[PDB]
């Protein structure tokens, strides 16, 4: 399978996977979980989500 790639200076229809930062826990940092913005300390608990 020979894959070809084109690099014309034009609006690219495919770039790749958008890189997401690591999960910084136990520290007051800014978070953006698909729209949900703000600042808080990411800590887990024993809640049961649906």
């Amino acid at each position: 399978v020979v894959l070809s790639f084109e690099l014309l200076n034009a609006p690219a229809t495919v770039c790749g996977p958008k890189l997401s930062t690591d999960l910084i826990k136990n520290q007051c940092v800014n978070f953006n979980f698909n729209g949900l913005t703000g600042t808080g300390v990411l800590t887990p608990s024993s809640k049961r989500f649906q």
Partner: antibody
Amino acid sequence: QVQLVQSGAEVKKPGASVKVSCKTSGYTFTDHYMYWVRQAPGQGLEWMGVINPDAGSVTYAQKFQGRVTMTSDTSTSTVYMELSSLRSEDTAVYYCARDLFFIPAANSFDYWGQGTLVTVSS
Amino acid sequence: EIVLTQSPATLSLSPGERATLSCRASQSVSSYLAWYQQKPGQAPRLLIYDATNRATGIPARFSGSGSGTDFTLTISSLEPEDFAVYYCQHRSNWPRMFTFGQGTKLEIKR
């Protein structure tokens, strides 16, 4: 036989837009790189102007980045060039040539058109 | 971008001799060089592509050469319908760039 027929002369005011076409025929116009050149009187031509007819990818030079915009039509098999902000040094004959290789590859020009004399004056 | 410099820029010879057309680049580019033949008044025509292969319709009298930074075009026998300006095009690799030279006039020596 591969042949590229262009339009005739077209005089335009210094500040309007020019629309010059490049009709291609004689071959399967699906996978072939289309280029554009223009030999200035006394000077030469130096820019790529490669446009993908099948896809919507375009490529311009450095001196002409936001002044020229090209488009293709897979139905009529004819590309169109739109050069805005016409200067007094661009009044020359515009040519459109094909490529020797296909879209993934690239090579020199093999089939040339006929020319389109464009003038910007009174 | 890689610029092309032509020192002779002219060649006055008689029909029957060999041409000494040159095309030198700035840096140490590869052999991706292609010459042209544009008759004054008519449309340009490809002469030699990739500097190592013969194009279609071109007779056997045209035979180019060169490697890296020393390119030359040697014609076997000059023809009266082959006296025109010759341009060489240099292409880049990554940003789909194409650069042209200045051209060398070939007038009939008289």
